[PDB]
Amino acid sequence: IHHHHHHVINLKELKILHTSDWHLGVTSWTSSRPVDRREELKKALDKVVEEAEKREVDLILLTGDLLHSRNNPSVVALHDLLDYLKRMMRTAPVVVLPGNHDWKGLKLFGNFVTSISSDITFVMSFEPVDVEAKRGQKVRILPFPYPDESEALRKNEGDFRFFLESRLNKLYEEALKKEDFAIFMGHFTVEGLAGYAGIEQGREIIINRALIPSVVDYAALGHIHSFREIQKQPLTIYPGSLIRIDFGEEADEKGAVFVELKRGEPPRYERIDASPLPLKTLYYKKIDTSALKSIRDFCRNFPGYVRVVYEEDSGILPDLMGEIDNLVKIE
Template sequence: MLKVLHLSDIHMGSSFTHGKVNPETGLNTRLEDFVRTLGQCIDRAIAEPVDLVLFGGDAFPDATPPPFVQESFAKQFRRLADANIPTVLLVGNHDQHSQGTGGASLSIYRTLAVPGFIVGDTIATHRIRTPNGDIQVLTLPWLTRSTLLTRPDTEGCSLAEVNHLLIERLQPVLEAEIRRLDPDCPAILLAHLMADRANFGAERFLAVGKGFTIPISCLIRPEFDYVALGHVHKHQNLNPDNNPPIIYPGSIERVDFSEEKEDKGYIWLEIAKGEVNWTFCSLPVRSFCTINVDAFEEDDPQEAILRAIARKPIQDAVVRLIYKVRSNALERIDTAQLHEALKEAHTYTIRPEIVTKIARSRLPELGAGNHLDPLEALQAYLKNREDLQDISAEMVEAARELAGSEL
């Protein structure tokens, strides 16, 4: 069986706001985190070694990353070329120019003719020769309107109508590639897309709404032994029957707090024609930790906040502290003490939320099941309004007069 490592959504160069400058290197520590995590994936690929590495797209946050970020990415993938491990780099939505014309951040690897590297920026099938046999990889990069549609096709159409047209155009193109597959050679679909069964990760906030949703029926095909996806940051298998497995490995690092509770990793795959075994391999990534404290009713809000911090595993984590206090209690918060309590964190932010009033509890005597006349209802209401006690008698008398005048 062939060994394949499938990873995706590196987004190298993102999450800088959650890091700090390393004085020894001059680099943001979050960039160093991403490089370290990617390096662990490459280490595994070389140590085995694998027969093929599949990258599912979104190398960077955008198509024009800073040179030092590109260099950090290239140094890791260059190790695969040096080890003679074939690699397919698929173009994702973040790898493309905003107009959707090409994969600017990855096409350099084709231009430089990096040995063994294939850049998947078109719908095409690639037959790859490995020491343990051949394998077919059908690449399906991120689709934009301009990929399969012209401006007259979409003029005056709603987003839903454009999506329908795109699927109509995609299906015969994909079908033509599938029919050209060698039935005796293992086949993988490598695609960067949003499938209609997928659960969002942080990509919901990273421009996922600008794309299209592909029906899962386009992917569940007997000709594919494995479907390797990218785009969604949360690991998941969209076809639990595994005929074929349709897998998002998820992103390899946490991009923001929306991924706080998600495991990060890559897929280890052993494949032959008609047989596939896959495993999700977790990566030891930096933890994110949210500390929410409602100190509105606390007599000592400072102590309540400190207790909440002490209960959380904040060492070397990216932390955000959010606490709610009364406006008149804000001056009782010793911010310097909070900074001291959070110093074990990698980085942290503190966000106070001032609550000026609390919602009043409902009065049981005014519930829907009780029947009070208007005067009784008013009296019940006034009993629970301390600020109106001085004038409550006058209000009740005025109400009686109004009620009497209407009889």
């Protein structure tokens, strides 16, 4: 019973697990009623890990912000990240495209970890890397990380947009230089999203979906919280977060993406539902006796969190947050 990669001859298939935007260490609604989302997030994370072992994925892709805090993650958040990273590695080889971190030492540690292990790879530049999947599949990764060299901080609108296109063009040329499979990994915002509102904000890199290399077998994206099927040629998917961060994601479906690739057959995928706690926003003109009736009746049998939005004040409001544990925000 070994624990290394297999080597099947003439194998032309590739099962991929794509999850993104874990936001580990997040505490929601700190200005109204602080709620630690760790237990819910870990539960959702466990379900994704189990599904990876269930379907026996060949490669695991990680994008978006795995940590909620960009430049100051808690010890607990870091612990959970390293925990689930190891859990992923026991299942299949992992490829990680980090988001915004603002720490220079991270690239050093990223290259170090990548060098000492054959089951995890950190792409923190535009340099394409070749990786080996669980069953010995040759997979070329075309990474498009967040633009560095202070180009995001300061750059002319003409050159910067031409800079992004030039980088994408080189990724296209190098995608043709592939052995078996070629996967695109990007950390940006697709031009004209319908209708993910509330990002970032934050700095945004706007890229047309047509500029993404068409010769790749799969385009793995992140940074946005909602699931999005951008296109089919090539298959471009935002997995979305695993939990509902704020009430803007009330009607969102959270989870991961399972992608299967064949040499002759076109790409197919299934959504892996994480089934996180639901959210709900109740609207009222004034919080009258009728409004209090509706609020208490709804929050009674609701397994998730509730926000109440009203227009104008009308007398002293009862301690609703006291009698109702579900109510996290009356704004």
